[PDB]
Amino acid sequence: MVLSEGEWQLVLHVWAKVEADVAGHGQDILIRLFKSHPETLEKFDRFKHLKTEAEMKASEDLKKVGVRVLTALGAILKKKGHHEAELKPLAQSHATKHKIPIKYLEFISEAIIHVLHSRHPGNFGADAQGAMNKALELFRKDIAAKYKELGYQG
Numbered sequence: 525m526v527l528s529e530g531e532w533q534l535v536l537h538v539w540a541k542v543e544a545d546v547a548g549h550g551q552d553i554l555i556r557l558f559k560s561h562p563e564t565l566e567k568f569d570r571f572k573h574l575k576t577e578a579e580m581k582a583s584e585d586l587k588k589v590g591v592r593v594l595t596a597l598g599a600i601l602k603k604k605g606h607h608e609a610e611l612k613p614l615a616q617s618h619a620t621k622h623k624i625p626i627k628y629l630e631f632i633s634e635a636i637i638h639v640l641h642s643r644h645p646g647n648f649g650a651d652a653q654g655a656m657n658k659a660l661e662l663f664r665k666d667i668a669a670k671y672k673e674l675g676y677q678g
């Protein structure tokens with residue numbers, strides 16, 4: 525798939541608002557994930573222990589990870605589709621070290637859209653949301669293809 529410049533602009537425009545507070549958004553997206561799809565939390569040996577949303581909120585470690593998640597995602601989005609190089613090492617670690625199914629990338633996508641929707645209503649109307657969904661869809665499809673090449677495709 526291919527996004528139009530207009531669609532990229534909508535993505536980048538909300539993203540710029542996310543960038544005003546990476547850590548806070550990182551935290552909101554992960555907690556959202558963990559709450560909606562608790563099975564995802566099992567994938568994190570580091571966080572597995574966290575029982576309640578309050579604990580999750582208090583975890584500096586969880587916060588730290590959210591920043592790394594968003595930072596990486598942000599770098600990919602800014603590439604506007606030319607993200608081969610950035611994807612490689614991400615696909616390698618997620619497929620071979622972390623074993624993260626495409627399904628779970630679907631769930632995080634859903635959490636991202638949910639949080640942007642809540643926090644940036646004015647910059648996240650139907651068009652912007654559609655643009656974001658395409659971008660996240662393109663990410664997922666390219667990562668899936670890499671998984672396959674790497675022997676995981678799952």
Ligand code: HEM
Nearest residue numbers: 564567568570592593596597614617618622624628629632
């Ligand atoms: C938007 C998609 C995601 C991006 C951009 C992303 C990015 C990252 C990055 C950059 C790191 C550090 C380097 C590395 O290990 O690759 C990381 C670690 C990790 N990620 Fe992803 N990831 C995403 C989705 C997920 C999902 C959905 C899960 C599981 C449900 C997952 C599980 C992990 C785990 C368990 C680690 C290592 C955590 C630790 O021991 O600190 N990630 N992730």
